[PDB]
Amino acid sequence: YSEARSNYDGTSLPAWPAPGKKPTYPAALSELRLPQPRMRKTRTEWMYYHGHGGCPGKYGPSREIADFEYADGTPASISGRRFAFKHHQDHLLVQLIRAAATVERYDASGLLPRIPGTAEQRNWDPAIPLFLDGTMVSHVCSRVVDERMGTPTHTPNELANRHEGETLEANTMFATNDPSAFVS
Amino acid sequence: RYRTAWRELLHPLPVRARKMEWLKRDAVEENEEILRRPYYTIKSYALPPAVGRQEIRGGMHSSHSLDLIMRQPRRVKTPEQLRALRDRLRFIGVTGPMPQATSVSTKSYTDTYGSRLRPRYPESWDTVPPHQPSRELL
Amino acid sequence: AQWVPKTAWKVSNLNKRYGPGYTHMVHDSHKLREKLSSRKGIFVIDVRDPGERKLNPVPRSVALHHHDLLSGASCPILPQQKSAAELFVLASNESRGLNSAAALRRWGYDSVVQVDYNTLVEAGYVSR
C-alpha cells in the first residue's frame, strides 16, 4: 500500500485543531535575528522547515521511505547507495556523540575557560566585557597560519612602537556597561 | 548636497546585490553573536533546561517539539535517582568480563554462539544490518 | 505621579571627575539579620578564593566565580525574577564585590547588596 512518515517512529503533532478553534500557523518570515528587514520564507526555507534539507529528495520521507514493495507485502532489497546513506546518517550521529563527549571530558578535566571566546576574539570584538583578575612541517604551517591570522591590524608605531616592545593599555574612560549600545 | 548627489552616481553594485551583501553582513554578525557566548552554563537538576535562555514571534518554528521538551521539567530530579538509574545501565560490546549477579543459568549470546557468528538479520530497505562483522574490529 | 526611571540616576557615573571607578560597605547587623530572617531562602552568592571560602565556610550560600557571573553561565541558577529578587554578594575584596555587582546589574539585577564575612557572622546568617 502507501506509506507516509515524517518521523522515524511515525508519530507527529496533531495535524488538525479541535473543531471550531483557531489553528496554529508557522512563522512566515525568515528566521533573521534583526527585526528588519522582514522577508517571507522562500521555498527552500519552507523545505528546511518541513524537514527536507534544502532540495527535495534529501533527508526527507521522499528518500527514507521505500520506493516500492511487492503486492504480497514483501519489501525490497538493500541497495549499495541505501547502505551508504545509512552509513552517512550513522556518521552524523557519531560526529554529534563524539563532539558531545569531547565537551564533557573537557569540562571534567577543567579545560573549558570561564571567559567566552578566544584572545583574538576578545582583542577584536569590543562587545565582549573585560575580564580582569614524525614530521614538523605541519606544525610550522599551523604556527605560520596563526601568526598570519592572529592580529589582522597592528597598533600604529606612532602610538606604541612594537619593535621596542611598547604596547598600549585599554582606555575604558568612555566605555558603557549596557550592551544596548552595540545591540541597537 | 553636491557631494551626495555625485556619490549617488557612484555604485559598484545594484540594489539587489547591495541587499544580498547586507544580508551577508547580518549573517556574519549573527556568527559573532553566537561565538560571544560562554563555554558552559551552570544548571540545576530540577529546573527545566530552558530556564536561563537569553532569548518574528507568535508563529510556530521547526524546533517546536524540541522547545517543548526543553520547557517540560526534568525527569531526573536528584543525583540519587541519577545513580540508581545509571548503575543498572549495561554495556554489551564492552571489552572485559561481566558479572553474573542475578542469574547463573542465563548465558550470554556470545557465550552461546561464539564471537564470529551473528543472527541472520532480515535484510530489506527498512532493515539495514551491520554487514561484515569482521570489518568492525579496528 | 510620573515615575522617574532608574536609568535617569545613571548619569552620575558619567562624571569624569567624580565617577564611581576609573559601594555597600556599611550595614546594620540587626537590620541585615532581620531582613535575612524574613526572607528565609538562598539569596547569598560568595565570590572569593576557594581557600578563603574553605577557611571561612558559609552554608546556604552559592559559590560562584565572578567571571562566570559576568559571562552569564549562571543565569538559569539566578532567580529568573529580576524585579523582586535581592542578592547579597559576599566578597573579601571590595573590588571583587563591585565587579560582581556590575555583572549582576548588566545581567539585570539592580537589587544587589555587598556584604562582608564579619557582617554576616555578627548578623548570624552563617552558623558560627
Binding site: 558531545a100 | 551552570i42 | 552568592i45 541558577i77 532567580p79
Partner: peptide, 23 residues
Amino acid sequence: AAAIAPGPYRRVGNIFIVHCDDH
C-alpha cells in the same frame, strides 16, 4: 521563585553545527 535555584549544580557545555555557505 525570587530565590536562587537550590540543590546540586551541573555544568552543561555546547556543540556547534557548522555549515559552509560559500566556496
